């Protein structure tokens, strides 16, 4: 009977935990935890939530191979 607007994010559980860490560092990110592979996230952050993801997967991967 209620309807709220958000951003449905579908990803693997590891990326879900990473997004929960983004919400744990910056706040005002994740609105709800739907299941193991979906999340309700503030739309105005999605691009950021994406870009930061790249950053946190750029700090994790390393691999300069030089």
């Amino acid at each position: 009977a209620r309807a709220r607007k958000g951003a449905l994010v579908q990803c693997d559980p590891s990326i879900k935990a990473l997004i929960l860490q983004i919400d744990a560092k910056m706040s005002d990110i994740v609105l709800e935890e739907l299941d193991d592979t979906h999340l309700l996230v503030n739309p105005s952050k999605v691009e950021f939530v994406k870009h930061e993801l790249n950053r946190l997967l750029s700090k994790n991967i390393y691999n300069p191979m030089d």
């Binding site: 559980p13 590891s14 879900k16 935990a17 860490q21 193991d36």
Partner: peptide, 9 residues
């Protein structure tokens, strides 16, 4: 797994 991933981090 998720638990070993968050505990791994």
């Amino acid at each position: 797994t998720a638990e070993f991933y968050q505990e791994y981090l």
